[PDB]
Design a protein around this ligand. Sequence first.
Ligand SMILES: CCCCCCC[C@H](C)CCC[C@H](C)CCC[C@H](C)CCC[C@H](C)CCC[C@H](C)CCCOP(=O)(O)O[C@@H]1O[C@H](CO)[C@@H](O)[C@H](O)[C@@H]1O
Ligand SMILES: *[C@@H]1O[C@H](CO)[C@@H](O)[C@H](O)[C@H]1NC(C)=O
Ligand SMILES: CCCCCCCCCCCC
Length: 376
Amino acid sequence: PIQRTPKIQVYSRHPAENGKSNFLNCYVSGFHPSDIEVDLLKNGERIEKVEHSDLSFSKDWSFYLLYYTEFTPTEKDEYACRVNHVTLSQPKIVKWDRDMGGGGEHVSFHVIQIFSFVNQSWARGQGSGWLDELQTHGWDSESGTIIFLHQWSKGQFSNEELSDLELLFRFYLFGLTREIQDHASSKYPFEVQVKAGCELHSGGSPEGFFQVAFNGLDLLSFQQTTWVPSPGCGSLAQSVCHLLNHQYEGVTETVYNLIRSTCPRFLLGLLDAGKMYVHRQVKPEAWLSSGPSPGPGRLQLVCHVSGFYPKPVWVMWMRGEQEQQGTQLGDILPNAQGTWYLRATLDVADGEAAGLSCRVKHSSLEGQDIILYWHH
Ligand SMILES: CCCCCCC[C@H](C)CCC[C@H](C)CCC[C@H](C)CCC[C@H](C)CCC[C@H](C)CCCOP(=O)(O)O[C@@H]1O[C@H](CO)[C@@H](O)[C@H](O)[C@@H]1O
Ligand SMILES: *[C@@H]1O[C@H](CO)[C@@H](O)[C@H](O)[C@H]1NC(C)=O
Ligand SMILES: CCCCCCCCCCCC
């Protein structure tokens, strides 16, 4: 409790051309609880070499996962994303289909924790590090060590400082668990989610946060130096804010230092070390495919823009210079190696399809847009 149903999006990283090698992405988001089963399928079989990000969540507090794998489109073969969840009567299988598109400021650094307590002596725990929507760290649960995903993931910190963080985290975890095992007594499962870290805004002003959700609900947050419960009431929230407020501070002194000070300095180190490796402005490539039929005598035009970085992008359906108002822009989804994916669709009558084109705007293009024309 309580329950959210997974949303599933499947998309390739390149145009689909039979025999030619490609990447199958599956993005699974909007779900609660965290317990889930995602497989990429080839011809009904589970593909055993896949990549997945660790479990993360949205501001909603609902979870999302990215999945991907190498694949080769063929006339013959068949690919899917199969998801099982407590909100699903049956595992949803959503095929990837060329012809349907395969249906379904500031920088930030945050540390993510998910704790799953089935009871007192049984509990999963997982945590990771995120630089904006790019995962940069993992946590080795069994040894209490940090997994550095990229060559630049130490991000201009020394080994000696990163050791201290590891140790720090270890104690802290011991803390949460003992603390959470007490508060003990028709039941019995619950979930806890912590999002701790910092935004850095243009001009250099940082903004820490350390916020908790209980069973997918806002529980409490750290707000410019005061732990603050979310409206309930709301007594677990007030009680725990109370413990953290006044039983122990010095932990909040630590936390304050961590999120206002350590965090942004780490974050900027990440940015500095990352620039070296990856990546400059990257041009998207684009392609057309139909999408699912909107009905008899009607077509769905899909326009895919993939592999562009940075994120800011403009995509629209056109007749000439006229924007077509029906255009629906999907969400901008992440690709395997960190670039972006977006698709725009348009539903149109059979005979009015000819002459419509997809226009794509991006920084990397030097003002020379990508134009693609629908043909029959
Ligand atoms: C499974 C989940 C694992 C998740 C970890 C994944 C992390 C991933 C992979 C790695 C990225 C690494 C990067 C470089 C980190 C940059 C800095 C980040 C932005 C700040 C992070 C914020 C934390 C999250 C807040 C934690 C609370 C701390 C630690 C203060 C509490 C003090 O315990 P203590 O006062 O010493 O207190 C101790 O513990 C208890 C009380 O706490 C008590 O019992 C004891 O008295 C004891 O003293
Ligand atoms: C915890 O759940 C597990 C798994 O179902 C079970 O074996 C165990 O007895 C449960 N409770 C406690 C208090 O150990
Ligand atoms: C180990 C004690 C320090 C923990 C600091 C964060 C506490 C967040 C509240 C969690 C309630 C479920």
